[PDB]
């Protein structure tokens, strides 16, 4: 057959099964809460995040599309849907990520993030994105705000509100309209509404730059209108102060014009894993050693553990 059957299970949760405890956020999406989910008949309590909206027919369709994608993913670096609650306003239930988004975590802990953390997050994001490539899914919205922090040692990719799955032979995705985040998009996406896994790599590059700059806004002050122009000339984001040319060289490769010349997510896992084995050699951070967030063979330079070598 053309493609494999998606036998994932969509779990439906009774409103009684979970207790809403506090409001976490409220924005463009709607309203996210912190809660606890006690599966009936079990002696278990699960810290969860709940998303509800305001009832529009197109709004529910978008929520259910995100639910379809989140329910089909199973990876340590991807957020998974626990279930949906079908009350008058539909509720999505995910695992609580206590530390919130990575963009607000780097901004808040700017003077306590060591090179070992930055490089470990780059590896973890590349692992989640590579798993999404294996599952023929193109995210289309990879950014530091769409990466959650379970613990400072473990992050996961979220926000499947724009993600499109690809058919076994379909290699590109031809979008038509909608509010798209311009400062993270590949040049093909801006000019021709084309999205591949290689356009995700471009957004991975911008995400890494956001982390290396501790939350700086890309192309700050410059409007979306002339951002396409700047990229066409040959201008890219500047080299973050803490970055050695090795780290910045990888970012610049993510931003090539030829999508096929950009690195693959499996290559990004290898490169950043090598760097995480000697972090102070690739990121120069003011007081790198005194920071805390809550060899038998000859040349150990290109040594990579098999768990990071994926084909
Ligand atoms: C900085 C990022 C941000 O504000 N976002 C809001 C919309 C996006 N998002 C985040 C979550 C979410 N998921 C899990 N745990 C969270 C914990 C938080 O604080 C402790 C938190 O604070 C805002 C957000 C968390 C969700 C989300 C929640 C439930 C379901 C669902 O999708 C089906 C997504 N969305 C990033």
Curated annotation (Swiss-Prot):
Domain annotation Protein kinase: ranges: 18-283
UniProt-annotated binding residues for ATP: 24-32, 51, 94-95, 159
Top-level taxon in the UniProt lineage: Eukaryota
Effect listed in the UniProt record for changing residue 10 to A: Abolishes phosphorylation
Residues recorded with modification Phosphoserine: 1
Active site: 141 (proton acceptor)
Tissue distribution: Ubiquitously expressed. Isoform 2 is also expressed in ovarian cancers.
UniProt subcellular location: Cell membrane; Endoplasmic reticulum membrane; Golgi apparatus membrane; Nucleus membrane
Positions where Phosphotyrosine occurs in the chain: 173, 309
Effect of residue 165 to Q: Found in a lung cancer sample; constitutively activated kinase with higher levels of basal autophosphorylation; more sensitive to gefitinib than wild-type
Cross-link Glycyl lysine isopeptide (Lys-Gly) (interchain with G-Cter in ubiquitin), where in sequence: 22, 43, 58, 61, 171, 233, 264, 274
Residues at the site labelled Important for interaction with PIK3C2B: 309
N6-(2-hydroxyisobutyryl)lysine PTM sites in chain numbering: 51
Effect of substituting residue 91 to R: Found in a lung cancer sample
Family of the protein in this entry: Belongs to the protein kinase superfamily. Tyr protein kinase family. EGF receptor subfamily.
Disease: Lung cancer: A common malignancy affecting tissues of the lung. The most common form of lung cancer is non-small cell lung cancer (NSCLC) that can be divided into 3 major histologic subtypes: squamous cell carcinoma, adenocarcinoma, and large cell lung cancer. NSCLC is often diagnosed at an advanced stage and has a poor prognosis.
Quaternary assembly: Binding of the ligand triggers homo- and/or heterodimerization of the receptor triggering its autophosphorylation. Heterodimer with ERBB2. Forms a complex with CCDC88A/GIV (via SH2-like regions) and GNAI3 which leads to enhanced EGFR signaling and triggering of cell migration; binding to CCDC88A requires autophosphorylation of the EGFR C-terminal region, and ligand stimulation is required for recruitment of GNAI3 to the complex. Interacts with ERRFI1; inhibits dimerization of the kinase domain and autophosphorylation. Part of a complex with ERBB2 and either PIK3C2A or PIK3C2B.
The protein's name in its UniProt record: Epidermal growth factor receptor
């Amino acid at each position: 057959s053309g493609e494999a059957p998606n036998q994932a299970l969509l779990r439906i949760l009774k409103e009684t099964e979970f207790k809403k405890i506090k409001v976490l956020g409220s924005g463009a999406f709607g309203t996210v809460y912190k809660g606890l989910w006690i599966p009936e008949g079990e002696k278990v309590k699960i810290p969860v995040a709940i998303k509800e909206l305001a009832t529009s027919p197109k709004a529910n369709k978008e929520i259910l599309d995100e639910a379809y994608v989140m329910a089909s993913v199973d990876n340590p670096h991807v957020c998974r849907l626990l279930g949906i609650c079908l009350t008058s306003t539909v509720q999505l239930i995910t695992q609580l990520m206590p530390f919130g988004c990575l963009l607000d975590y780097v901004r808040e802990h700017k003077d306590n993030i060591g090179s070992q953390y930055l490089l470990n997050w780059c590896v973890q994001i590349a692992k989640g994105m590579n798993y999404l490539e294996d599952r023929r899914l193109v995210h289309r919205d990879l950014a530091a705000r769409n990466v959650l922090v379970k613990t400072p040692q473990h992050v996961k990719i979220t926000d499947f509100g724009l993600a499109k799955l690809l058919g076994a032979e379909e290699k590109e995705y031809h979008a038509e309209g909608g509010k798209v985040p311009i400062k993270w998009m590949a040049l093909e996406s801006i000019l021709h509404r084309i999205y591949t896994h290689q356009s995700d790599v471009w957004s991975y590059g911008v995400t890494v730059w956001e982390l290396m700059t501790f939350g700086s806004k890309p192309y700050d002050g410059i409007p979306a209108s002339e951002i396409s122009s700047i990229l066409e000339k040959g201008e890219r984001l500047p080299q973050p102060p803490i970055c050695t040319i090795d780290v910045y060289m990888i970012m610049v490769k993510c931003w090539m014009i030829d999508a096929d010349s950009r690195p693959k997510f499996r290559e990004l896992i290898i490169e950043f894993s090598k760097m995480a084995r000697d972090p102070q050699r690739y990121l120069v951070i003011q007081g790198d050693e005194r920071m805390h967030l809550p060899m038998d063979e000859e040349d150990m330079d290109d040594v990579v553990d098999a768990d990071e070598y994926l084909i």
